[PDB]
Amino acid sequence: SLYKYLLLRSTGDMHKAKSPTIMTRVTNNVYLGNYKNAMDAPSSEVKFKYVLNLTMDKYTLPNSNINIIHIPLVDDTTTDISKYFDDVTAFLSKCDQRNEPVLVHSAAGVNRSGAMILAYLMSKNKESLPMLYFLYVYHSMRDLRGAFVENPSFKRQIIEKYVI
Amino acid sequence: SLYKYLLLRSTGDMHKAKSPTIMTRVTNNVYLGNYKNAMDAPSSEVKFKYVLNLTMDKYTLPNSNINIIHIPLVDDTTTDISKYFDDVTAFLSKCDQRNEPVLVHSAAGVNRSGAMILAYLMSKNKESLPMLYFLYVYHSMRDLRGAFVENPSFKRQIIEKYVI
Numbered sequence: 001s002l003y004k005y006l007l008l009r010s011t012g013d014m015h016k017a018k019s020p021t022i023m024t025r026v027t028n029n030v031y032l033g034n035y036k037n038a039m040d041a042p043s044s045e046v047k048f049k050y051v052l053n054l055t056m057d058k059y060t061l062p063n064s065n066i067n068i069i070h071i072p073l074v075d076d077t078t079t080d081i082s083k084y085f086d087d088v089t090a091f092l093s094k095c096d097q098r099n100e101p102v103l104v105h106s107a108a109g110v111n112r113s114g115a116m117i118l119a120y121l122m123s124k125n126k127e128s129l130p131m132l133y134f135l136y137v138y139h140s141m142r143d144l145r146g147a148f149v150e151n152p153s154f155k156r157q158i159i160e161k162y163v164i
Numbered sequence: 165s166l167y168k169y170l171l172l173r174s175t176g177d178m179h180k181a182k183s184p185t186i187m188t189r190v191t192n193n194v195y196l197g198n199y200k201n202a203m204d205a206p207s208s209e210v211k212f213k214y215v216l217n218l219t220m221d222k223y224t225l226p227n228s229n230i231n232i233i234h235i236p237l238v239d240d241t242t243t244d245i246s247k248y249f250d251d252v253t254a255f256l257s258k259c260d261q262r263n264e265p266v267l268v269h270s271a272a273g274v275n276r277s278g279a280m281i282l283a284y285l286m287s288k289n290k291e292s293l294p295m296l297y298f299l300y301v302y303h304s305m306r307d308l309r310g311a312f313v314e315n316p317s318f319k320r321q322i323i324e325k326y327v328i
Binding site: 004007008009010011131135155156163 | 167168173174175176177178295298299302303313314316320323324
């Protein structure tokens with residue numbers, strides 16, 4: 001079933017992109033979100049230890065004890081994001097090992113953040129053929145979120161690192 | 165390269181569908197076309213022996229010596245088309261063996277005809293992993309034609325027969 005699903009999605013059976021609104025729990029401790037979700041982090045049902053801010057602006061949450069890690073990226077078709085895949089995925093893996101909730105976010109919660117979450121999931125996959133796992137994670141996340149790594153340059157970088 | 169191509173196409177990097185206009189030579193003797201292409205068959209640069217008419221109407225070309233084979237199908241999401249895959253692909257294979265040009269057509273040259281051409285190409289593949297070959301043929305034909313088996317029920321039937 002999941003296989004027929006992947007092949008139909010892969011041949012144009014996708015919905016038009018829609019903006020995510022709510023935070024998504026991706027793993028036990030790793031969450032994916034947009035800017036509003038980051039602003040709402042301190043009051044979230046989840047007790048975040050970390051927020052990974054992938055936007056260009058270095059904001060603060062001065063009334064919170066959250067540690068905000070800033071990795072400034074631009075959502076464009078020219079930026080290398082792959083230079084940070086190894087260190088970001090190692091950091092997210094450590095958050096999961098230590099049960100330290102972390103919110104990975106960008107402005108829209110689609111491209112810079114979606115790409116780091118896709119990299120994390122690919123990095124954690126030791127079981128499945130990378131090509132199949134990539135299609136599965138891509139489409140299942142997109143169906144859940146509404147839009148997920150729409151930026152084709154970011155998708156290309158994920159494919160180069162984890163599939164090719 | 166062809167691999168990176170497939171994976172980007174498979175994750176939403178496709179163009180909006182556009183109607184095919186000109187006939188496409190798919191193999192040495194097998195061509196894919198719309199209704200206008202069928203009407204223009206007798207005067208074509210190609211000396212067709214056969215036209216496979218997949219539309220519901222049994223037309224004639226009374227001034228031509230073309231043999232018109234009628235397999236009436238509807239382009240809808242309910243029709244089994246798979247019941248004819250074995251006999252159609254065997255017939256197309258025979259046209260290629262005998263160097264007898266054949267035009268496979270529907271009304272739009274996209275769905276009923278595109279699906280029989282995709283089935284033919286899958287049937288002729290003995291070399292490549294079916295999942296990869298399916299994605300390659302699908303996307304390469306769609307890029308060439310503008311639109312190619314957009315009907316998701318027909319795609320599902322191809323996947324069931326030749327991939328699963």
